[model samples]
Target: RFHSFSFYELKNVTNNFDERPISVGGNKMGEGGFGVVYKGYVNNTTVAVKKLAAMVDITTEELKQQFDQEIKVMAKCQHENLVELLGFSSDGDDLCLVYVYMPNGSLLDRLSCLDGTPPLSWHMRCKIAQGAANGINFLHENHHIHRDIKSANILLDEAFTAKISDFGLARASTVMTSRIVGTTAYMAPEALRGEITPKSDIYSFGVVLLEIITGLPAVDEHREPQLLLDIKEEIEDEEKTIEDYIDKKMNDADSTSVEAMYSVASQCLHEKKNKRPDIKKVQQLLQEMTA
Candidate 1:
């Protein structure tokens, strides 16, 4: 079992769930499908408090089950590349999960230089990619499918090391489903058809690699082809080289390293699930690039 915290204690640390603007150093960090996260201080240490959202279709009992499931999965899967779940609070109908605070926010925001932050250098980008791959590989080894592997889910700490977050959607088994989940832009062809395997996660990771390389969003209506995955066709058709898609913001991108990463991403985005490299192989490739 995991540590449990009283709801009142969580409130005290978060100033009664204060959601001040980020610009003012407010507690509210961000929101996701599960809930809103607030920056809280517990025992003089910073933490992130995720307040689970109340869904109209889900009964209180189901929500509790989901909360417990998350705790069970998180507690069992501990790795340096994964976010640390500090504890959880269950008070009445309100449920919250606490985690280590990630000062640098998410890989998505960093790639775009959100808040006028400097763009990540090529070296840092490589390091982040490798760290994220290591984390995902760990999850697969533990028989857990992350189910969501977008850049936004890949968080960065003060040192810019990658830590995979938001295990709310993770499933212990690779099964088929009629229902679709996760962001559409990152979904693999098989995943779109309701099949899920570790390879589905690989496909999503490929999209993240593309984001890291191009500094482009997974989907952009303003751009021709819209989805970044379509770049595969453009590159194969020889209309543009991988070099043309490299993030212009990157100042120290080495051509050899960039090309190697592109090759890895290409394999990851293979249409056939069987063609996609396993997470372990992906991690090895990324490690070699960084080395």
Candidate 2:
């Protein structure tokens, strides 16, 4: 009650179950285990509201618990690249959470042309890489593991800044009992072999980073027999180059910056998990690229 809003005020802000909502739902910003989010207006503020999906719906007690848990964890987390969970509602079945809306929607929407747009600019792509890496670092630093991360989970604000969203898959360090989580496509190669570690998230971040650069999903038609998600072979063998693997949108990018992104992403995608840089190292390398 103290953290989100006074229970009564939140009800009033929602206008006692008002019918006129901002954005009801969509596939591009599809529901996950966390459920679908709709654009909404709270306190005259445009926000994204993630609520329960019917299939995975839980009882009021369960929803309240999830909402409470998320609020507690999210309240302590701070990062420019991670969505700030504004507040939550535990009023009966209304286990809704409010967050800063990413006006541009998920990276997948832009990358997959789900929005009928050309791939993101190489410059924007680098920003996304840098931002997402920073978000991952924030989660780990807070002792939370974001088990699922993908193109779709990487959202963008109106200014085209990348911010990691959907923390429902996150769990505390004390709870690590070797439980497996996240999509198979973005899971680390070692995770495929049933291993768990911070490196696993690092690996997944690399795959998503590559996707951002190439404007391709980790899973693609060309990677037929074995998806590119599992393709450890470099798209270019000669020390790697953004020109070789980067999406055509990269044509206008500076050679110097492109080369740096390529080097950092390549190291992140290294087959040997130990050789891959941690999210902190990745964040630093990316910052240097832009500087």
Candidate 3:
């Protein structure tokens, strides 16, 4: 089933990742802040190999439970919108995971197109948002907490179909008590206070939603008065509309085209956790909006 593989077997498959095959500045896909990811061929098929930077010390039973939890999470949460973990390998001091290669890379890759590609179309952006919402909703339904949800963790297939990655791997990391979860800008206020739940994922996904809407950072304040605030003032003070915040690169929009999504994004950013719509409501609204 390729759910688990020994180091020896992974060597046979990836040839020891001899080519150092595919890496972006030698960074792993989601954990790029650290670690390395190599693209390689496994049994004549392409796969992504995410290798941790260092090995850890843990009891055999602890390791077993961790792997089992990771496997179970990946196996049980197999939705079209969720990334699949192909397999994993562990050696004396080496740990790595094999995953289905995402040819189109991440939403972040497309959002910040260094290659000069035009911004994604409004239709495609909405599709990506709905796909991500569906994936997060599935995780929440399964009672799994996704501590991190950002554009970089949202992968895209060759057809621009979005799939959520970084879920299983982040869960695996949670087994270590010393490990801290959550990203800086993507974290919800509750998470900053040590409470991470499905709503935390929702909050992070809200930032991603904003990114998708405006083609900006999860919390882009680099500009004067920041984009979100700019949008807020434009809408509240100027009596303008979301059209002002739509990514200029999108190049197509009307007063109404962005209203529904903007409404959803606003709910996600509500200060009170209870004010946020649950994932199911979010999924339904997003799917309907895209529809």
User: All models: lDDT?
Assistant: 0.82, 0.68, 0.67
Best by TM-score: 1
Candidates 1 and 2, the one with greater TM-score: 1
Q: What is the per-residue lDDT of model 3 for residues 190-227, given as tens digits with 9 covering 90 to 100?
A: 76676656777787787777777778776555764454
Backbone clashes in model 2, listed as residue pairs: none
Model 3 spans > 4 angstroms off? 6-34, 54-69, 114-118, 168-180, 220-241
Question: Which one is best on lDDT?
Answer: 1
- Could you tell me how far off, in angstroms, the CA of residue 250 lies in candidate 3 after the best superposition? 1.7
Per-candidate TM equals 0.93, 0.79, 0.80
Looking at model 1, which ten-residue stretch has the lowest summed lDDT?
55-64
Error of 3 at 269 (Å): 1.3
Model 2: weakest 10-residue lDDT segment is 20-29
Cα miss at 182, model 1 (Å)? 1.5
Question: Tens digit of lDDT per residue, candidate 1, span 169-276?
Answer: 677864788656666888889888888788988898988888889888778899977998899779878998888989999989988888788777888899898999
Question: Following a full C-alpha superposition, what root-mean-square deviation does model 2 have from the true structure?
Answer: 4.4
Per-residue C-alpha lDDT of model 2 across residues 1-291, encoded as one tens digit per residue: 223644344445544434443344321244545455656566677666665544453555655555666676677776887877877766645567777778877887777766465668877888888888888889888877666667777888887687887776566661234445676777776766656666777777877876776677877666542344443364554454456666775565676776677667667777688998988898898899999
